Amino acid sequence: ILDGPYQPTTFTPPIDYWILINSNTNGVVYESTNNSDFWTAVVAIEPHVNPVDRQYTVFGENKQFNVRNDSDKWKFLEMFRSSSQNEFYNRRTLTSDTKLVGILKYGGRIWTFHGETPRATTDSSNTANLNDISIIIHSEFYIIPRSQESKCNEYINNGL
Amino acid sequence: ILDGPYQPTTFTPPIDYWILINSNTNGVVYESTNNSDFWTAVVAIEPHVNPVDRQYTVFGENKQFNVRNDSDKWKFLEMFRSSSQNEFYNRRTLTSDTKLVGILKYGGRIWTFHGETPRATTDSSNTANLNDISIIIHSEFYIIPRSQESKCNEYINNGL
Amino acid sequence: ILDGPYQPTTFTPPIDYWILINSNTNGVVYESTNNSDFWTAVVAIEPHVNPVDRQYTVFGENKQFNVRNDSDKWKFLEMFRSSSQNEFYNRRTLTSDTKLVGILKYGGRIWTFHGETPRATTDSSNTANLNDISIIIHSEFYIIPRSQESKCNEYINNGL
Amino acid sequence: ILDGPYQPTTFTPPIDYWILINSNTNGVVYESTNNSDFWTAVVAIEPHVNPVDRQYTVFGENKQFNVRNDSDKWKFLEMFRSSSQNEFYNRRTLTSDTKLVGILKYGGRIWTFHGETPRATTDSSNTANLNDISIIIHSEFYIIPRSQESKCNEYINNGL
Amino acid sequence: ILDGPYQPTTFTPPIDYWILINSNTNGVVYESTNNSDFWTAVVAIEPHVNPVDRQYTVFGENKQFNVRNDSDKWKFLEMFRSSSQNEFYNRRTLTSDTKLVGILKYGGRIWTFHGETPRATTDSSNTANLNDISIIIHSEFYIIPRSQESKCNEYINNGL
Amino acid sequence: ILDGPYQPTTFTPPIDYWILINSNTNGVVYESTNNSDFWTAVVAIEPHVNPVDRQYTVFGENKQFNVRNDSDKWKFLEMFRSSSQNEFYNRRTLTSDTKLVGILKYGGRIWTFHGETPRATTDSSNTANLNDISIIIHSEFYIIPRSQESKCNEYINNGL
Numbered sequence: 003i004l005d006g007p008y009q010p011t012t013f014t015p016p017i018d019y020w021i022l023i024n025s026n027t028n029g030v031v032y033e034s035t036n037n038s039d040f041w042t043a044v045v046a047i048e049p050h051v052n053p054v055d056r057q058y059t060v061f062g063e064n065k066q067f068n069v070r071n072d073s074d075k076w077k078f079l080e081m082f083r084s085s086s087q088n089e090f091y092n093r094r095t096l097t098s099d100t101k102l103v104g105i106l107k108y109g110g111r112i113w114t115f116h117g118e119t120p121r122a123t124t125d126s127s128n129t130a131n132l133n134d135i136s137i138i139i140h141s142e143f144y145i146i147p148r149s150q151e152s153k154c155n156e157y158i159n160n161g162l
Numbered sequence: 163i164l165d166g167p168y169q170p171t172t173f174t175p176p177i178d179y180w181i182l183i184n185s186n187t188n189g190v191v192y193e194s195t196n197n198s199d200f201w202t203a204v205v206a207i208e209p210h211v212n213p214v215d216r217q218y219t220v221f222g223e224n225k226q227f228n229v230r231n232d233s234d235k236w237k238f239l240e241m242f243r244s245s246s247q248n249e250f251y252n253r254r255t256l257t258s259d260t261k262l263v264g265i266l267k268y269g270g271r272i273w274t275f276h277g278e279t280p281r282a283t284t285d286s287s288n289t290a291n292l293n294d295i296s297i298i299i300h301s302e303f304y305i306i307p308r309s310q311e312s313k314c315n316e317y318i319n320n321g322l
Numbered sequence: 323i324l325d326g327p328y329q330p331t332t333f334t335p336p337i338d339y340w341i342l343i344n345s346n347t348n349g350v351v352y353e354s355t356n357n358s359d360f361w362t363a364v365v366a367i368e369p370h371v372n373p374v375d376r377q378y379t380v381f382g383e384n385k386q387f388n389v390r391n392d393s394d395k396w397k398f399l400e401m402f403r404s405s406s407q408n409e410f411y412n413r414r415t416l417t418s419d420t421k422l423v424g425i426l427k428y429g430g431r432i433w434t435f436h437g438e439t440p441r442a443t444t445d446s447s448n449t450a451n452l453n454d455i456s457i458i459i460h461s462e463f464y465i466i467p468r469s470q471e472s473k474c475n476e477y478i479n480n481g482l
Numbered sequence: 483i484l485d486g487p488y489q490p491t492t493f494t495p496p497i498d499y500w501i502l503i504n505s506n507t508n509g510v511v512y513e514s515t516n517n518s519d520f521w522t523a524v525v526a527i528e529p530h531v532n533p534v535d536r537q538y539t540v541f542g543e544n545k546q547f548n549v550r551n552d553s554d555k556w557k558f559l560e561m562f563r564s565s566s567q568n569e570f571y572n573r574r575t576l577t578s579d580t581k582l583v584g585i586l587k588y589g590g591r592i593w594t595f596h597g598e599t600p601r602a603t604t605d606s607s608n609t610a611n612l613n614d615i616s617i618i619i620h621s622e623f624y625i626i627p628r629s630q631e632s633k634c635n636e637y638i639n640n641g642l
Numbered sequence: 643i644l645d646g647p648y649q650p651t652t653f654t655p656p657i658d659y660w661i662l663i664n665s666n667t668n669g670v671v672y673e674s675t676n677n678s679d680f681w682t683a684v685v686a687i688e689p690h691v692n693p694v695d696r697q698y699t700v701f702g703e704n705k706q707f708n709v710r711n712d713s714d715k716w717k718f719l720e721m722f723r724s725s726s727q728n729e730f731y732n733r734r735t736l737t738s739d740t741k742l743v744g745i746l747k748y749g750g751r752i753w754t755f756h757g758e759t760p761r762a763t764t765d766s767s768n769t770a771n772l773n774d775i776s777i778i779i780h781s782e783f784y785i786i787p788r789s790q791e792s793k794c795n796e797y798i799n800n801g802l
Numbered sequence: 803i804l805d806g807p808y809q810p811t812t813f814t815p816p817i818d819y820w821i822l823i824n825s826n827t828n829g830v831v832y833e834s835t836n837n838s839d840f841w842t843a844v845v846a847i848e849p850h851v852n853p854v855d856r857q858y859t860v861f862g863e864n865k866q867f868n869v870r871n872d873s874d875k876w877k878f879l880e881m882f883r884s885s886s887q888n889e890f891y892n893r894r895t896l897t898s899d900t901k902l903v904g905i906l907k908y909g910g911r912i913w914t915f916h917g918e919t920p921r922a923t924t925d926s927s928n929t930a931n932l933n934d935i936s937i938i939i940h941s942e943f944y945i946i947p948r949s950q951e952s953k954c955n956e957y958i959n960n961g962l
């Protein structure tokens with residue numbers, strides 16, 4: 003009953019659906035924005051990376067992020083800014099060996115998974131415009147209704 | 163000169179184009195909403211279905227609808243609501259053995275086909291926000307300019 | 323304990339507060355918009371006016387509205403559009419002999435009063451961006467916390 | 483060269499300016515929020531208040547705060563939350579016999595004064611969205627450019 | 643029918659309205675910015691001023707501008723910058739014996755008056771963020787709908 | 803490093819990315835609009851076409867465009883209108899033997915290439931609503947961050 007996988011693409015995710023992205027390299031996993039007050043780009047950091055500066059293309063710009071991962075698992079860094087003039091900061095991190103990342107539009111808020119598998123949990127971010135948040139997804143992904151969030155959770159924490 | 167077929171997808175359909183969906187199973191054919199005053203999901207009922215409660219995923223929720231089909235043809239039920247806190251009701255039905263369903267954004271209204279093939283006709287639904295109506299399409303579809311609605315009509319009623 | 327009256331002005335009302343406007347003429351009571359998907363202007367119609375076209379300045383434009391009022395009470399018509407390209411239509415009406423109109427930003431929605439006093443009730447309207455909805459208020463007005471909505475209700479239906 | 487006084491009002495303070503509020507009663511001095519990750523309301527406690535629960539209207543809600551002041555001077559309590567679903571806590575206090583409080587948007591942070599006059603100093607609070615922080619001010623206030631912060635400091639600690 | 647005068651204040655002007663400011667001294671007439679790509683401050687230069695450096699407080703900072711006026715009329719100089727990392731340059735000038743200055747948010751641009759009365763004309767400046775354009779006005783001002791721009795032009799060039 | 807090719811589709815291009823379209827026939831290359839103040843359709847004219855009216859389907863309607871190409875290269879005609887009530891006119895032309903056209907949403911404007919390869923240059927068109935500009939693309943295309951605009955320029959003028 004798993005809807006997918008879908009090819010990398012740019013679209014406005016519908017309300018009340020988890021987008022479950024299967025990361026496949028150490029680059030930008032997705033870029034999300036409404037172009038007013040919400041910019042989040044997730045970068046994937048492979049295990050055992052001493053702190054270092056890396057260049058990522060994010061929202062059409064070349065940006066330098068200092069990056070580290072002292073874990074056996076991958077680390078997916080949520081880099082956030084609320085205006086094109088602010089610099090990004092690492093707002094949240096998901097530490098995972100399943101390499102799946104989740105994003106949901108629900109209840110006026112953006113929900114993502116953070117923590118460390120197999121015990122990662124959801125967290126919310128506010129915005130003045132949830133409906134207009136669009137996403138560029140750089141890997142294969144799946145769509146899971148919120149009615150089946152418990153399944154998505156399981157996937158996030160245990161793999162497909 | 164038929165534009166398509168395109169793969170299942172989520173997007174905001176352009177104004178003044180018929181979306182012509184070729185249904186392939188007895189589930190949700192498409193879901194359309196502007197998240198303000200218009201929600202429509204079309205469910206496909208195969209021929210000769212005694213009254214029965216069926217579960218469907220619509221706008222991320224698990225909804226139960228009682229459906230029936232006493233016909234030799236398929237029945238495509240428009241489940242409609244005008245508020246996110248209302249339940250759905252069966253607003254229109256397309257009885258068809260071509261299994262093609264159509265939806266058009268035009269003149270401030272949403273136009274669809276209803277009735278029974280080969281004599282299905284267009285009907286309109288009002289909305290205060292036509293431009294922000296988006297759609298999730300669960301099967302292959304085609305795009306037809308409104309300038310060629312006659313052709314679309316033909317297809318709806320007679321198939322490709 | 324009533325906060326006000328405040329002079330006519332343009333501002334972005336804070337979340338979770340009723341704005342209570344004391345209309346004083348048969349013109350535009352207020353104009354509210356986020357400049358993306360929500361435009362509401364309220365026009366005041368004095369009692370016993372046979373249907374007639376009248377010119378109003380709304381959102382910087384000269385608009386002609388056909389208005390009628392058979393009642394002995396004033397009629398406050400909510401003219402709404404979701405796009406600067408659409409025509410306004412009369413979305414709601416508050417029939418009142420107190421000349422008080424209310425607007426509240428709460429729960430992701432815009433709440434106003436409609437119906438006929440002293441039995442007027444609240445109703446909501448959806449938007450993709452509630453926070454950025456600003457208002458031009460053409461009369462004296464008061465600010466009442468949502469915690470005291472019952473008082474606001476009394477005011478709307480009974481006068482100050 | 484002192485810009486003010488201005489009347490109580492709600493607005494989005496410009497970046498790089500101190501708002502200097504002259505408190506005149508033992509109520510809410512101001513309410514400040516961006517509706518995403520920052521809510522501060524300052525309550526004024528008169529001298530010699532034994533520990534007591536007091537009700538205040540903050541951000542449209544009735545809240546009950548435990549307050550106390552055993553000093554000869556007034557206490558201005560910053561009640562803070564970073565999420566609408568958290569209850570407030572007393573994050574900072576300004577103990578003052580000048581009854582002047584200050585708030586500034588600058589360098590990605592909110593700056594206020596705390597400590598005890600005439601030795602009160604500035605302190606910062608972080609936010610993901612500085613530009614959308616607005617304020618409701620319940621008494622007269624002045625605008626001072628950050629270029630003249632020394633003057634503001636003087637006033638905070640010594641009066642006008 | 644002229645809406646005003648209003649007292650000096652800080653606010654976000656509504657889209658599609660001229661703000662008509664009656665300058666009353668040789669200082670900063672107004673400051674406008676969206677804090678992303680648009681900063682404009684108009685300075686008033688009395689007649690017969692030899693080229694000289696003057697200090698102005700703009701956007702909370704002390705800035706030195708070299709100003710001149712060899713005419714019998716007042717000169718209003720637009721100092722502009724497209725980034726907080728840049729210095730201001732004199733982008734436009736309005737030469738006027740009426741001491742009225744105009745600014746309008748419309749069509750994705752900021753419109754002002756320039757040239758010399760009674761033959762001043764409008765011109766536009768681009769922005770990517772018009773909705774966030776806020777203004778500090780240091781003199782009395784009026785609000786004129788764009789539908790009455792001719793009248794505004796009249797005032798600009800001839801006085802009230 | 804080149805992102806693509808992607809299949810013909812309808813979507814809202816992200817801000818700050820060049821869409822680089824590889825035209826493959828003498829039809830409509832793309833259609834772009836926000837349904838408020840911006841409509842552009844690019845039509846491809848093969849070499850050596852005498853001035854003639856040709857029929858194209860744009861934005862769901864049949865239109866006749868006066869078209870010509872007296873050169874050895876292809877010509878890509880931008881047909882533009884600022885309102886649905888206006889007729890299209892040839893606003894710009896790109897004369898090219900690479901058959902690549904470019905469109906970018908940036909800085910409150912739409913940027914395209916015009917002129918003649920290998921010295922085609924970018925030009926801008928204003929809009930009040932850049933976020934809502936969507937595109938129907940009728941051939942394979944690539945996405946190039948604005949940070950790599952030079953590479954896009956190279957492609958435009960010299961091919962892949």
Ligand SMILES: CC(=O)N[C@@H]1[C@@H](O[C@@H]2O[C@H](CO)[C@H](O)[C@H](O)[C@H]2O)[C@@H](O)[C@@H](CO[C@@H]2O[C@H](CO)[C@@H](O)[C@H](O)[C@H]2NC(C)=O)O[C@@H]1O
Binds near residue numbers: 273
């Ligand atoms: C004044 C009014 O209500 N006009 C209706 C019109 O809506 C206008 O369409 C304009 C087109 O851009 C514009 O948007 C304007 O703002 C609108 O008021 C339409 O809704 C038409 C519908 O015509 C019907 O179209 C469907 C779909 O193609 C066809 O299947 C129907 O056959 C067709 N009906 C008729 C009688 O032609 O109605 C009003 O003209």
Ligand SMILES: CC(=O)N[C@@H]1[C@@H](O[C@@H]2O[C@H](CO)[C@H](O)[C@H](O)[C@H]2O)[C@@H](O)[C@@H](CO[C@@H]2O[C@H](CO)[C@@H](O)[C@H](O)[C@H]2NC(C)=O)O[C@@H]1O
Binds near residue numbers: 586589593628631
């Ligand atoms: C965090 C950082 O890199 N710098 C801090 C700085 O913030 C920057 O300010 C820039 C303004 O030109 C620009 O906005 C940049 O993007 C920011 O990173 C400031 O936050 C200062 C704090 O300066 C303090 O300001 C308060 C309020 O005026 C004063 O009361 C303090 O006395 C003052 N302290 C100091 C040491 O200057 O901190 C970082 O430099």
